[PDB]
Symmetry: D2
């Protein structure tokens, strides 16, 4: 089998099939005609992501939320139950609790790392088990293989949001997951210029999602133009993730030596709670770092406002380094003790480590750390 | 208030606000940063404001597709126990969404003739939350009395949603007739060049805000690409000129078909024989570019007609510069059987034409030639 | 033979040969393995519209002009030009190729006697625009062509003002036609592009020499696709530009503040007859002169609220310029007239917006001036 | 000063100035009302990477080269050229500007004594590539710059092969640098573009003369945006290109079918020392000569399954070419020799694919070349 990098560049395409074009032409057309009485650009992206993820088929959508909703609207119906990881991406949480959850679908959050508890929460109604790994809060890891075994016993469908790792660092399908969902807007695109989502899994499941969730319940159609840009980004996925991870590791070790830092959440540190599990499922620790300042919410606010290279934003996986402090940002409306509920610390700061020179990033952080004193 | 053409070209944008750029720059960025610890795309926002102006509404919302607009709207407005009244015939995928989608999540569905104001009111219940229909409706251009149902909906407290794809704001403005919301498959006439897929919702700020923050944000994620939104605005700049041409060509072709021996019946709002001729002229400033007619030869003449076309393309879509034609019996519903189609109001010889922008003489010759071949 | 509108939409493309795609896929690729189909389609379609054998697509109007002349001329060669030319074209001939041993001479392309007297054995090319930027000055294309053949010179006409929809120089004897597709062809002011249409022999030479080696004015497939998109409504847009322009022109002709009007659609137009012989419609460009001179023109411009103050034309948006206070803010009354640039000359690129809105803007500005 | 990668991603742009947009909006507009921002950002960024004062963006590498030379030269002037040049550049000089009174002379830019001896009061420009396509022949940039400075000649270096990440001629004395951004800068083979970087004085002249009036090789803003996108991973891509090429070069050097191999990264490379003095890494291009001559080459090329048979380089996909049976197929064996092109010469633009896959393809094709 050709290597990952080779497939990310060539899988599913032969220039001789399109007039010798080295780069596939963009099928920016809404409709196709018939000689007598699917979009190729999108089909290539899908086959390529399926190949990288180690799955039978792929589906491309307008956004990560488009992929999540199309998938869940397809697999769930009133009466069905869905077990969820204890923490989820903001909009995913809203979708479940304020969306499909208000339509007769039962929801329940369980620690996906606690196989005992998971086995206990299972019921004959449990139709889907959905979670992210690592999870948005403090990189909580889930035992994918362990969860898949239980799910396989009860006949439940396992859906894993693999946004953070990408197929390059983790492949849940190879660990038992039935479906993998991605916000391709992040690492896959890698350049923060498109919004897109991806679904990969068995031909049977993906066909259903395509013809039901996407076609009829969301209409989250991805533009061929953006699909092309996404494939452009995927061509450097391995190289970009290597740098993201190498930069993050150095930055994490630097932060671990800071007096002002109380706690550090990074899979690459030996003191990481689930260090062993992470290494079992991930080939590299990732480009995301979560940490807490001893000064609480005030220290985080000052740290954030002093950053000059890092950007204050909510996304991740871009060439540019990004930082966010939920306490004084996304969750600024949530009162102190109230904020703690969602697991958000008052001094919790999350960094999406970019591709810029590491010493420049270390210098920005060092400089900002001084301003949060 | 400036004229329609003027607003379709200028509304919401002043070059002086973006370094003098005559054409607004495309914000192809997924994220925006903040200067301090304490989010909408300018390209989509312009598109939305412009469509709101054209439709005469308070606010607009842009989505990845027409279905994205329809699903985001309905997922927002409906919850189990709610009832939605539907026009008797709907777009294939919309019907599917309703009966195999949201309808399977506890929402009650009921089809009613939206042209029959008495029947519609008779179907109103305290659970009725939404009234949804297309006008004209896909099958045979059946019209709905928009102002009429709007009055009823107002007396019973239901939200009126009209799919205005076929007419576009240039030919019909439901919001001005009393509708609360209008949805569009911008993929059709608005884009006008068949190169993008997009949807639009226009209505009150209250309703659109909810759809944006609920349906779109959490339930569909049908986000429109800034690149496509820019192309959509490019297409809208010639909307009046294109619709004028689509209609002029369609009227000519319609009057032609009405004189052909192979044609059994014709459904075109512009012909005096159209059953709802009077209602149509009251809601539409022009008869449209869509023609539906039936061949006497049945499903055989249809297939023959379709295969003989040289200029018109055999495809399932409409509103493109290129003329398109389709025969449901031998295309979209071919799988089904005569009875099946009969039930859905689809005759064996029903052919639908989306009259394009090419030379009418070339169009007439293509249809003439294909009609002869339908023998 | 399909009509113009039909060809502008279908010529050279059949979905069957591209997986059924109604709209041709965009070949955004720098190279191929073992000519770009998107550019070829655009070229083939433009050739059909202009009625020529071959077409060539370039990065800009200037790319088309330079690539053409760089190919056809060499030191010692002589080129005859119309008395007036687009600013950058003038700069190119006099400050560019004219500085590499190529001889230049301007002649009134409407005065056949003068053109024949200006012809020499060294005359290799005859280049001009028609109508000509200044005040719509027309050139007798068929007439200049007859002289060119007799002498064996190549006739190149810049046809961006009319577009193949209103005028086709090739059918009047021209050998090559050049366009700033940036204008009316695109029609939406979002791309910069150039087009050359002519015989296969001439175009092949320009492609392989001027473009490939001397300018590198390569058009992006993305922009070529947008250009074809614009071309699909060319007939409709030009119809409206002309209809709007005629109304505005007749209006200006009744206003006291206006001393003179330059519009082919008015019977008073000096070359009315010739114009109607080469152009199917009078066009969407209007040039007129205010009585108040540069001061009035300046007041007129600053008062405009719908028309935009910019230098370009052929856009959906109406545009206006006053050379004396804009492109020629420099100079003085002398040099101005030295180039036929009246102190009160205002040029309008009449857009597609509602004629009532356009009239209101012009009326208000007209009052504002004076 | 921030590092190269940091500048490749951030230089010249601050989100705050554009509504907080992380990625700068694309100014896809032909005109402005009362200098394209997208093009300006690309230019300022390229200038920073190359360590120059200003940059200019054009439609293609040839647009950059022609705009540059058309501006700096005039009849009577002389230009000294490296011995071997890119195909189209050679054609531009000999069949283009060289036919307009400009004197041309080829000199080995590695031989400083010959260079000095070739200097004349008429020498206005010294143009060359380094490495030079053929066999990666290097030029002593600082050496030639010192000479040009003494005589007052402008030094222009085509730096596309190395990119600013591996070599910065400006820092070595060159006055101007040109790039076919279509290659490594873009890195994904989907756009055609050129870049010129140098002093504000030289770049201003090239923009207002060469480009504006003599070539019109304008770059599409959409393409400039894609180019900036590619530049954000330049360092990462070049590191991989170089790593893969080194391994492939060392492999090829040990193969029986290989008679001569040209890769700057091999200790035995003739100008190994000079190369390392100017380039931070040996590059992703490899040229080698097969023993079986033209027949072996054609055999080798047809057997390739991963490498694509094409004429270009700097793409994520590996590309290979055999001049004798491809671009130079029409010449005679002697004519090719005259240009330093062996009948068995094969050039490889090593891509980003997995090295083990690249090795297997080359190995397998090597056996078939027999």
């Amino acid at each position: 089998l050709p290597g990952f990098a080779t497939r990310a560049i060539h899988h599913g395409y032969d220039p001789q099939d399109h007039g010798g074009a080295l780069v596939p032409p963009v099928y920016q057309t809404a409709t196709f005609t018939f000689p007598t009485v699917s979009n190729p650009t999108l089909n290539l992206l899908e086959a390529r992501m399926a190949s990288l993820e180690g799955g039978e088929a792929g589906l491309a959508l307008a956004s990560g939320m488009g992929a999540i909703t199309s998938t869940l609207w397809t697999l769930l119906r009133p009466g069905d139950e869905v077990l969820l990881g204890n923490t989820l991406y903001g909009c995913t949480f809203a979708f479940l609790h304020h969306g499909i959850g208000e339509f007769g679908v039962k929801l329940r959050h369980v620690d996906m790392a606690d196989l005992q508890a998971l086995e206990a929460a299972m019921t004959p109604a449990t139709r889907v088990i959905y979670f992210e790994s690592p999870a948005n809060p403090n990189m909580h890891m889930a035992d994918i293989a362990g969860v898949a075994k239980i799910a396989r016993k009860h006949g439940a469908t396992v859906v894993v949001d693999n946004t953070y790792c990408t197929p390059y660092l983790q492949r849940p399908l190879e660990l038992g997951a039935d479906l993998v969902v991605h916000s391709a807007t992040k690492y896959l695109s890698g350049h923060g210029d498109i919004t897109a989502g991806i679904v990969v899994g068995s031909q049977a499941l993906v066909d259903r999602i395509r013809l039901q969730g996407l076609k009829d319940m969301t209409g989250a159609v991805l533009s061929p133009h953006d699909a092309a840009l996404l494939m452009r980004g995927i061509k450097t996925l391995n190289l970009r993730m290597d740098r993201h991870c190498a930069n993050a590791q150095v930055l994490a070790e630097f932060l671990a030596r800071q007096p002002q830092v109380e706690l550090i959440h990074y899979p690459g540190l030996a003191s990481f709670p689930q260090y062993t599990l992470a290494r079992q499922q991930m080939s590299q620790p990732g480009g995301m770092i979560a940490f807490e300042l001893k000064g609480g919410i005030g220290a985080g606010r000052r740290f954030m406002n002093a950053l000059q290279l890092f950007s204050r934003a909510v996304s991740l996986g871009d060439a540019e380094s990004l930082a966010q402090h939920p306490a004084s940002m996304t969750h600024s409306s949530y009162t102190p003790e109230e904020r703690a509920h969602y697991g958000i610390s008052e001094g919790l700061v999350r960094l999406s480590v970019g591709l810029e020179d590491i010493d420049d990033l270390l210098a920005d952080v060092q400089q900002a750390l001084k301003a949060s004193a």
